[PDB]
Amino acid sequence: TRKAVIGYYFIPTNQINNYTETDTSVVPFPVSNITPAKAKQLTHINFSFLDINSNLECAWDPATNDAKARDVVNRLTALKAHNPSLRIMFSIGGWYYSNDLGVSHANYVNAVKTPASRAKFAQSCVRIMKDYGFDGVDIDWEYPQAAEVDGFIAALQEIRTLLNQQTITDGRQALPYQLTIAGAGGAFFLSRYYSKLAQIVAPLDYINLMTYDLAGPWEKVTNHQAALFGDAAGPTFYNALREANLGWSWEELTRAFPSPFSLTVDAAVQQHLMMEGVPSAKIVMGVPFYGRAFKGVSGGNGGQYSSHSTPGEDPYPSTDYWLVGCEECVRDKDPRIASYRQLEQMLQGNYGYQRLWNDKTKTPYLYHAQNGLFVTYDDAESFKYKAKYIKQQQLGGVMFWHLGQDNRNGDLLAALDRYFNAADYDDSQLDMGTGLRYTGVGPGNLPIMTAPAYVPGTTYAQGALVSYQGYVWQTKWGYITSAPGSDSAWLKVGRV
Amino acid sequence: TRKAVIGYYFIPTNQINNYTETDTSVVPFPVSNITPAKAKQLTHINFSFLDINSNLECAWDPATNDAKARDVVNRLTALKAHNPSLRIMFSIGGWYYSNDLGVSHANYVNAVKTPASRAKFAQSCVRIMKDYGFDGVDIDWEYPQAAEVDGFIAALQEIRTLLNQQTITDGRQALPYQLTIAGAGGAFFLSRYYSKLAQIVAPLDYINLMTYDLAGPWEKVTNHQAALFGDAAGPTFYNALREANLGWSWEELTRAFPSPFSLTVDAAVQQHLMMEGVPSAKIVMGVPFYGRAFKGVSGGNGGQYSSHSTPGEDPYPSTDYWLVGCEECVRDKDPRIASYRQLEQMLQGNYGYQRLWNDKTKTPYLYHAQNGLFVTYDDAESFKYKAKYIKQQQLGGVMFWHLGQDNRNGDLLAALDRYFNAADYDDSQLDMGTGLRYTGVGPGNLPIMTAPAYVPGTTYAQGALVSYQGYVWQTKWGYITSAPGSDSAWLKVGRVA
């Protein structure tokens, strides 16, 4: 099965209301830049962002010029002429609109509260999809909290029901309408709904993990924002998942969630696979097409794992654009983020940057020794390892934020497509390194094992293994006189 | 309020059938050894054991000569003439009949299954009680678990309802029929029903903790079977309660169940107290009137915490009776257990036992330097600390297994009585020592705390404290924008006044 390649196309309301394909000053990345070749390398384009209004319905930004909006969307859907597998999805949410303190947060909370609120919300998602010509719905609520999860789940189910009916009604069996969500790519936010991952994922074609922003100025120690594997020399974090409402035992929690642990792309993917009912084929790995920059770093590790003096607040609470060479940072008034396109130019401009490589995390980074700058980002090389991991772990594919950040030749997207589909690319010898892998074991990723069948009447010593009801179990202490599943002394450690 | 003093009177079926008060080789401890003085020192005597038969009703072992049984019970209820507060309870169960692999285990499981079976069983309990002249019912199922707990709870509630009505019907308001259970005194068995303790204890007058047998042949390191507090030098154990179906977060389980931990009497009592809805007044501390012996002890620490080579199977497989001076052991064919009466005599003979004391555990032990023997037991001195602990912790009293193992003068029972009631005994300055206390905290013994009210729309740093909906909560990581509650970021750490 072809791996999914999901790229966000983000466009601000002001750029839509002023849409142009001839003036990068107003619209830096017009649809016209997605050439036929890029169109064939993508399987999905997530148009972003729409929101949920006080009427509790899916809707565009109130200031959007609907006529200009329709025209932008029509240019995207026209790209399907170049690739019959392409879907132009639309995304509702995003950090700005849906975070706890975001402008429209109450609407997300409220929209999923009742059967009637959900019905109306779901119906609006499909009407918007049909009216503008989209091929599916992606929800990016960052993020529902424990008490809102059941409602969120019911809303996704409602949408799934309506989309499946629409697919039949429109004769889209060949390219069914889809439903996806952008999911947390780190344990802190993931712990919000982790206990009910199976229910959340059931109605989706894909859960796109935002496995990036795993480091940033809000953290005290500089770090890679999307390390594939862990580096013992880098910071470690509290494993928030051991506090999710799983209802598991101490041994179960401890073996699934070692803490502290390395916040990596591999950790997030494995944490999802540990849950029963979360198929690997639905898990999509997100990657960033931008880097995060820090100032005030020390030496000795090329800028890595250093204290820094970068403001973590948003918006950027200053006017000092200190990321040397970053012209884009000036137009966007923030030196803490830089598109791969801009980073590539910075590197070729003799601005004092050195490109270093961390072979544990399998990610690149820039170090500016003169000014004390550090930049964590991804490139075509880090993408070789991530693509090989996606194939080995049998994941659904890759997702990225965002298309306007790739260079002019579209190298990052082309690389991803190459790694999955080129007949002449062979990564069989690609060395995945010795970086730290996440080793938790949960219900959904237990090893296959064998053991004598449990025998009613037998007394078992500590450490004894038996098979019962399809699993292999082990005793936590001795003189166990009752069966696995009835006597708490047993720990499920293997399957089949 | 007077502390309870509950003593088990255990008599095997063969002893009931051949009952005699003039032949110690037939009946080692007849009821006549319980003088009026001793009767006054007790508040309860638990006659043991009755059982639950295949018809799922409370019943005597079928081999019991019924007339002889009534005569034995009559001798016990006659004791009430000397103490208007004394109750002769009867106990259903015990290890032999009720353990998972015991001869009547299925009858316990099946009797509590449905409303109909529970009604029938409960009625049988009250019928036997009235028929034989008992004053209450004690259930000693060792131990219900899993799916059986809800049924067990419902059966206890039913017996309660029936006893309360029987009390009124018989005009027994001055001495109401009572209901108690013998409860696990160690975390491994306790973990079976721990999550539902409040429900189990609600219909009870008392839950008598079997806070002994915390060490034995079945363990590889020698140790005190009933240490009051922990000795950092002794073995520690896996805290099984952390595996019970509680629904607590990792932090909550870790704070409530330190592991490894010292298996002590104080641990069991505090573990019951960590659960909301379990009043100290209903908790009764059990103490042993017997000791456990081990052979093969390496010397150096008086035989404490040493490897040993004592058989663990039951019955005793050998014929080798290596407990020097324990003739009782010879009669009973087991050198691994001996009554305080017998241990006192062995201390008396010229056998070479050194009576030693562990000041952390507040318990005595014997050490036979010569033959490499170690005996863990309790005596009048260890009872001083346990009795003070009972008073300090506001527990309901003390329970013991069993009356027949006290010395002939009944010194152990008299000591317990003295410590709770004698005007001329004063433990106000008795030093409880520096032994390890159980310090787990569970929402059930959550302290009063004070913090600013949670403010919606605020972002909190790691470790921040706020008050919200009756509790004080702490953040486990930073940038917390969610409200305290089920949300994973907040930890309940205290109660709001």
Are A209 and A257 in the same domain?
A: yes
Is there a contact between A369 and A356 (Cβ–Cβ < 8 Å)? no
Are A362 and A401 members of one domain? no
What phi, psi does B453 have (nearest 5°)?
-60, 145
Q: Are residues B345 and B212 in the same domain?
A: no
Ordered alpha helix ranges (H), B170-204: 187-190, 197-201
Do both A248 and A128 map to the same domain? yes
Q: Which of A355, A400, A480 is nearest to A213 (CA)?
A: A400
Return the structure tokens found at B170: 């018989």
CB B293 within 8 A of CB B342: no
Q: Looking at the complex, does the CB of residue B242 fall below 8 Å from at least one CB of chain A? A: yes
Count of CA atoms in the C-beta half-sphere (13 A) of A280: 15
The token pair that represents A410 in the structure block? 């579209």
Closest by alpha carbon to B211, among B154, B151, B271?
A: B271
For B:142-171, CB contacts with A below 8 A are 145-147
A482 contacts chain B (CB < 8 A): yes
Same domain, B140 and B199: yes
The amino acid at A460 = Y
| Other C-beta atoms lying within 10 Å of the C-beta of residue A407 | 17
A448 contact B CB<8A: no
Cβ distance A192 to B487 less than 8 Å, yes or no, reads: yes
Partners of B495 in the β-ladder: B448, B471
Could you give the CA distance from residue B382 to residue A13 in angstroms, rounded to a whole number?
Answer: 80
* Omega of the bond leading into A143 within 30 degrees of 0 (cis): yes
Q: How far is CA A236 from the centre of its chain?
A: 20
How far is Cα A337 from Cα A293, in angstroms, rounded to an integer? 6
Beta-bridge mates of residue B136: B89, B178
Nearest to B247 among A247, A457, A489 (CB): A247
Name which of A147, A218, A482 is nearest B486 (Cβ-Cβ): A147
Question: Which of A211, A214, A229, A232 lies closest to A433 in space, CA to CA?
Answer: A229
Q: Among A430, A446, A462, identify where a domain stops.
A: A446
Tokens of B438: 């159980």
Do B90 and B50 touch, CB atoms closer than 8 A? yes
The 10 Å CB-count burial string (b at 16+, else e) for A229-249 is: bbbeebbebbbbbbbbbbebb
Q: CA-CA distance, A434 to A229, in Å (whole number)?
A: 8
Determine the Cα–Cα distance for residues A425 and A383; give it in Å rounded to an integer.
Answer: 13
Contact check, Cβ <8 Å, B488/A146:
yes
Amino acid at residue number A333: K
- What's the rounded Cα separation, in Å, for the pair A40 and A81? 10
Q: Are residues B355 and B422 in the same domain?
A: no
Number of domains in chain B: 3
Six token digits for residue B275: 């659960």
Regarding whether A261 and A360 lie in a shared domain, the answer is: no
Cis peptide before A260 (omega within 30 of 0): yes
B356 plus B485 within the same structural domain? no
Structure determination technique employed: X-ray
Question: Backbone dihedral region of B283: left (phi > 0), alpha (psi from -120 to 50 degrees) or beta?
Answer: beta
As beta bridge partners, residue A59 has: A51
Q: Which of B18, B487, B436 is nearest to B230 (CA)?
A: B436
| Sign of the CA dihedral running B224, B226, B227, B231 | positive
DSSP symbol at B488: T
CB A244 within 8 A of CB A191: yes
The residue among A363, A378, A393 that closes a domain is A378
**Are residue A465 and residue A362 in the same domain, yes or no?**
no
Verify that A425 and A336 share a domain, yes or no.
no
Which of B57, B142, B148, B328 is an active site residue? Answer: B142
**Alpha helices by DSSP H, B262-302:** 265-273
CB proximity list for B282: less than 8 A, separation 6 or greater = B201, B204, B205, B206, B207, B396
Cα separation, B361 vs B426, in Å, equals: 21
Of B427, B422, B467, nearest to B448 by C-alpha is: B467
* CATH assignment at residue B486: 2.10.10.20
Domain end: A344, A378, A412, which one? A378
CB A351 within 8 A of CB A323: no
The encoded tokens of residue B374 equal 């170690």
What CATH number does the domain containing A354 carry?
3.10.50.10
Same domain, B264 and B324: no
CATH number at residue B250: 3.20.20.80
Short-list B232, B226, B186, CA closest to B360: B232
Write out chain A residues lying below 8 Å of B459, CB-based. 101
Catalytic residues of A: 142
**Single-letter code of the amino acid located at B68:** K
Q: Please tell me whether residue B477 adopts helix, strand or coil conformation.
A: coil
B486 and A101 within 8 Å at the Cβ level: the answer is: no
State the Cα–Cα distance between residues B35 and B414, nearest whole angstrom.
Answer: 12
> Which amino acid, A478?
G
Dmax (CA) for chain A in angstroms is 81
* 3-state helix/strand/coil string of chain A: CCCEEEEEEECCHHHHCCCCCCCCCCCCCCHHHCCHHHHHHCCEEEEEEEEECCCCCEECCCCCCHHHHHHHHHHHHHHHHHCCCCEEEEEEECHHHHCCCCCCHHHHHHHCCCHHHHHHHHHHHHHHHHHHCCCEEEEECCCCCHHHHHHHHHHHHHHHHHHHHHHHHCCCCCCCCEEEEEEECCHHHHCCCHHHHHHHHCCCCEEEEECCCCCCCCCCCCCCCCCCCECCCCCCECCHHHHCCCCCCHHHHHHHCCCCECCCHHHHHHHHHCCCCCCHHHEEEEEECEEEEECCCCCCCCCCCCCCCCCCCCCCCCCCCCCCCCHHHHHCCCCCEEEHHHHHHHHHCCCCEEEEEECCCCEEEEEECCCCEEEECCCHHHHHHHHHHHHHCCCCEEEEECHHHCCCCCHHHHHHHHHHHCCCCCCCCCCCCCCECCCCCCHHHCCECCCCECCCCCCECCCCEEEECCEEEEECCCCECCCCCCCCCEEEEEEC
Same domain for A230 and A310? no
| Interface subset of A 250-269, CB within 8 angstroms of B | 250-251, 253-254, 257
Give the range of the structural domain holding residue A130, as residue numbers without chain letter.
Answer: 1-288+379-446
Q: What is the DSSP letter of B442?
A: -
